[PDB]
Each structure stands twice: as structure tokens, then as C-alpha cells.
Design a protein around this ligand. Structure first.
Ligand SMILES: NC(=O)C1=CN([C@@H]2O[C@H](COP(=O)(O)OP(=O)(O)OC[C@H]3O[C@@H](n4cnc5c(N)ncnc54)[C@H](OP(=O)(O)O)[C@@H]3O)[C@@H](O)[C@H]2O)C=CC1
Ligand SMILES: NC(=O)C1=CN([C@@H]2O[C@H](COP(=O)(O)OP(=O)(O)OC[C@H]3O[C@@H](n4cnc5c(N)ncnc54)[C@H](OP(=O)(O)O)[C@@H]3O)[C@@H](O)[C@H]2O)C=CC1
Ligand SMILES: COC(=O)c1ccc(-c2nc(N)nc(N)c2C#CC2CC2)cc1
Ligand SMILES: COC(=O)c1ccc(-c2nc(N)nc(N)c2C#CC2CC2)cc1
Ligand SMILES: [Co+2]
Ligand SMILES: [Co+2]
Lengths: 159, 159
């Protein structure tokens, strides 16, 4: 099983300047729970976005996508194509914008956190993929974070 | 991944007299979306609750738990232990109360339809399993069924 997990503002922005322009702790917990134990796949830039003291993510099979055949990620597997990374019974593609688009045709589930911030899209922003109607998606309600930001969860599936 | 999917009253009742004191088409669609294509594991009583006109459920691997080594379920596999059914990548335990409690230690997901029906428990009822605190759950909106009862969906998850 290949799943996609991401947090987005309403506008679809997921990343900017190698960072995530917000802090929503509830989403981090949600992310940790859904990924823990399983294989996680990320783009090389997203691997670069993590301080060395926080990578690899504990308890998961860290895999990095890069087209550099020689690229080292200390503590993760480096593959040159998704299917080399997808190897895994349950695999979760954890970002970023480039990888999500590459993987979506192989995914059956998308776990979406939507953050109620008016964050407009700027050139070079990383974006969430847009999910059509073939994704049956079950809408949560607008929860209130201890960070101060309104948020809600979506669970998408297509058979 | 071992999943549990069930519909319950607010009281925890899931079956009574070998069947279900409600019918929500919205919940049937929800069920088919989550189970379609995968292995479904059901107790023999639940298999008996399906007309032969409706079983096996199309497009899924139908598995029945029974202690009768000769029990015959036309269109399904009959297994005498639960671990036998777990060979497929995604397995959904679809009832009833006995099999739910047998499967809970293998489960990381629970897809719950909660029906707003004042249905007090009585002896003989089948019951939804009890979820300890290791289960975190995303509560849904009270939706409106065309049957006239409100409902809402839960997804419980644990690593
Ligand atoms: N909000 C969220 O939920 C998340 C947000 N983010 C944010 O996303 C942003 C980065 O995302 P993005 O900018 O899209 O960069 P990515 O994280 O998408 O990684 C892009 C890299 O992936 C590799 N790659 C892409 N396609 C392929 C392929 N077909 N085969 C092999 N390797 C490939 C390349 O590595 P190389 O250059 O080595 O070839 C490319 O540089 C950051 O700001 C980060 O914080 C990240 C994760 C989650
Ligand atoms: N609302 C919902 O979402 C659902 C409700 N239901 C309802 O639940 C009720 C049935 O649930 P329940 O009454 O608990 O009966 P079950 O559906 O749990 O089937 C029980 C049967 O499973 C087999 N079984 C149980 N434990 C084992 C074991 N350890 N090893 C091997 N075989 C085993 C036995 O088959 P044998 O006797 O042949 O050994 C037993 O009779 C019905 O009312 C049904 O409609 C059903 C599904 C979903
Ligand atoms: C301090 O902020 C955090 O620690 C934090 C922020 C966001 C997420 C998150 N959340 C959802 N829903 N999907 C995702 N793919 C990610 C991610 C990620 C990556 C690290 C590579 C997790 C943790
Ligand atoms: C005409 O439709 C129906 O009779 C009907 C549709 C759906 C369910 C249902 N619903 C949720 N949420 N979980 C479940 N495990 C099940 C189940 C079951 C099975 C007996 C096979 C029940 C009955
Ligand atoms: Co599915
Ligand atoms: Co999991």
C-alpha cells in the first residue's frame, strides 16, 4: 500500500524556502502516528530540510529520492526511482511537492491536513497535488490547535 | 494492515437477532469504498446473515472464520484461524462482535459509523469492541441519512 501524507494551507502551499511556514503540533502527532513503523519516502530537498539531529525519523524506514546516483543520506536509503522506494507493504510518501506529484498515480490513500491560514501561493512555493473527484475524500471538521491555528483533516481513498 | 470496519448505535450495539436494526445506504457505500478490492474477514454468523444472492461480496477476497472444519461457504475461503487470512496486503475485518474482539490485537485502523439511534443494549446483542487509550480517533460531523437517522464516521488509528 502506497499512501501520501501532507499538510497544506487552504491555497495548497506545503513548503517554502526549504521550510514549512507554520507550526501545527497536532498535525505532527497525526503525522507521527500514521507513519511510524512504516517505510517513508521523501524528496532529496525534504531530506535536506531536516536538521541532522532529527534525521532519520525514528522507527520508520527512511528512503530518499534523488537523481544523484551517488547521493548520500546518512541514515536513509537512496533510490533513483519511486518503485525502488515503494518496495514496502505499507509505504507513506511524506513530501515534498515534487515527490507527491510523482507518486500520486501509485497511491490509493491521501492523508491531508488542511491549515486555515491565508497563505497565498508565491512563485517557487511547493504545492500539494490537487485531488480530483476520483478521490473519495472524507472531510473532518475545523479543529482548533494549541498553536492558535484552525485546522481539519481529510482522508482520501480511491478503489 | 489489519482494519476493522463496523456500524454501531450510540449504545455500542452492532447486531441483534443475527442482523442489524437499521439500514443506511450512505454507510453501505462507505463500507464498499473502504473494503473493495481487499480481503474481507467475517465470522460464520455474519456470513450466515448474507443472502446467497449477495455473497460473496464482489471484488474482495471473502474469508469466513468457523470452527467447523467442514463448513462450506460457497464463494469464500473458510479458515479456522485468523492468522490464515492475513496474507493479503490490506485486510478488513467486517464483523461481527466475536470476530471484532478476536481481531483487535492485529488492528491499526477502525472505521466506525456511529448511528444516532437510541438503541439500549440487551442480552444477546452483538457489540462493538472497546478501544483502549492507544487508539486515537478523528471524530466526524453529524451527517443526515436519507433513512432519517443522523450518522457520523470515526477513524481510529494506532501505530
Ligand atoms: N507541508 C508538508 O507536508 C511538507 C512540506 N515539505 C516542504 O516541501 C518543500 C520541498 O519540496 P520540493 O521543493 O517539491 O522538493 P522535494 O522535497 O520534492 O525533493 C525534490 C527532489 O526529489 C528528487 N527527485 C524528484 N523527482 C525524482 C525522480 N523522478 N527520480 C528520482 N529523484 C527524484 C530530486 O532530488 P536531486 O535534486 O537530488 O535529484 C529533487 O531535487 C520544502 O519546503 C519542505 O519543507 C516537505 C515535506 C512535507
Ligand atoms: N453493524 C455492523 O457493522 C455489523 C453487524 N453484524 C452483526 O453482528 C452479528 C454477528 O456477530 P456475532 O454474533 O459476534 O457472530 P460472528 O459474526 O462473530 O461469527 C461468530 C462465528 O465466528 C466463528 N468464530 C468465532 N471465534 C472463532 C475462533 N476463535 N476460531 C474460529 N472460528 C471462530 C464461529 O463460527 P462457528 O460457529 O462456525 O465456529 C462463530 O460462530 C449479526 O447480528 C450481524 O448482523 C455483522 C457484521 C457487521
Ligand atoms: C516542527 O514541524 C514538524 O515537526 C512537522 C511538520 C509537518 C509534518 C508533516 N505533516 C503532514 N501532515 N504530512 C507531512 N508529510 C509532514 C512532513 C514532514 C517531514 C519532515 C519531512 C511533520 C512534522
Ligand atoms: C444492504 O446493505 C447492508 O445490508 C449492509 C451494508 C454495510 C454493512 C457494514 N457497514 C459497516 N460500516 N461496517 C461493516 N462491517 C458492515 C458489514 C457487514 C457485513 C455482513 C457483510 C452492513 C450491512
Ligand atoms: Co482501498
Ligand atoms: Co500504521
Amino acid at each position: 500500500m502506497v499512501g501520501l501524507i501532507w499538510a497544506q494551507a487552504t491555497s495548497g502551499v506545503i513548503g517554502r524556502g526549504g521550510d514549512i511556514p507554520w507550526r501545527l503540533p497536532e498535525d505532527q502527532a497525526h503525522f507521527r502516528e500514521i507513519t511510524m513503523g512504516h517505510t517513508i519516502v521523501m524528496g532529496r530537498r525534504t531530506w535536506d530540510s531536516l536538521p541532522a539531529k532529527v534525521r532519520p525519523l525514528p522507527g520508520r524506514r527512511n528512503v530518499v529520492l534523488s537523481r544523484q546516483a551517488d547521493f548520500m543520506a546518512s541514515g536513509a536509503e537512496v533510490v533513483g526511482s519511486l518503485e525502488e522506494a515503494l518496495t514496502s507493504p505499507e509505504t507513506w510518501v511524506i513530501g515534498g511537492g515534487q515527490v507527491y506529484a510523482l507518486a500520486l498515480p501509485y497511491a490509493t490513500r491521501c492523508e491531508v491536513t488542511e491549515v486555515d491560514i491565508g497563505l497565498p501561493r508565491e512563485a517557487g512555493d511547493a504545492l500539494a497535488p490537487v485531488l480530483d473527484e476520483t478521490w473519495r475524500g472524507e472531510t473532518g471538521e475545523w479543529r482548533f490547535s494549541r498553536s492558535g491555528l484552525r485546522y481539519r483533516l481529510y482522508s482520501y481513498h480511491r478503489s
